[model samples]
Target chain A: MDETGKELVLALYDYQEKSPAEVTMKKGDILTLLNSTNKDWWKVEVNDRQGFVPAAYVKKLD
Target chain B: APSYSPPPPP
Candidate 1:
């Protein structure tokens, strides 16, 4: 499997099922991008929780 | 009682 990928253009964090927290990247944030696949809804890490964000929001830079 | 409306979806 290909391990090389692109970086997220925007910073998003999860907040569902918990009090709204400040926007910051956590453990699951970077890992989510690494595991993303085409046509699969990318789980965005926001505020320490995971949310769904369109994959188009990301672009390949390398 | 006063009524309220929900915000529009994005």
Candidate 2:
């Protein structure tokens, strides 16, 4: 996938699929950040799946 | 809870 300008983030904690707009993530997984305008959750994608995750559960990568 | 919630696609 071409992600030249998009922010790549790392999952800092494990997340389970509990609600709408959210996706499960394994700790230490790399994900492409799509949006973070929401204060509580950020949208991300992995393995061709796109959904939101807790903002505190991920960190931007350098 | 959202009434439109759907399980993550498998």
Candidate 3:
């Protein structure tokens, strides 16, 4: 329950939620990168909300 | 008369 310090990533493009399991993100938004096991989609957290986002839309932080 | 030198040492 405490995998809290995962990688942070910055949104590179705005993504409209296309599926119920996906999250909408705006460009320049920062979010916690939770799971990247999927190649095309990643699970992320924003403001206590967690959902899948397009992997291409976010850039992993240094 | 087709005597040719050995290809000018490549």
Better of 2 and 3 by lDDT: 2
Candidate ordering by lDDT (highest first): 2, 3, 1
What does candidate 2's lDDT look like per residue over A1-62, in tens digits? 66534788898888886766678898879988988876567888876778888777888896
lDDT of 1 by residue, A1-62 (tens): 22213344342333222213212233234423433543423444443444444443433333
- Clash pairs, candidate 2, are none
Q: What is the lDDT of residue A29 in candidate 3?
A: 88
Please list the C-alpha lDDT of all candidates, in the order they appear.
0.34, 0.74, 0.71
Q: How well is candidate 3 docked (DockQ)?
A: 0.01
Question: What DockQ do the predictions score, one after another?
Answer: 0.05, 0.07, 0.01
Question: How close to the true structure is residue A61 of candidate 3, measured as C-alpha lDDT?
Answer: 94
The residue-by-residue lDDT of candidate 3 on A1-62, one tens digit each, is 54436799888888766666777788888978988877677788876678888777787896
**What is the fnat of candidate 2?**
0.00
lDDT (10s digit) by residue, model 2, range B1-10: 2234333323
> Interface RMSD (C-alpha) of each candidate?
13.3, 7.7, 30.8
Kindly report, for each predicted structure in the order presented, the TM-score of its chain A compared with the true chain A: 0.34, 0.84, 0.84
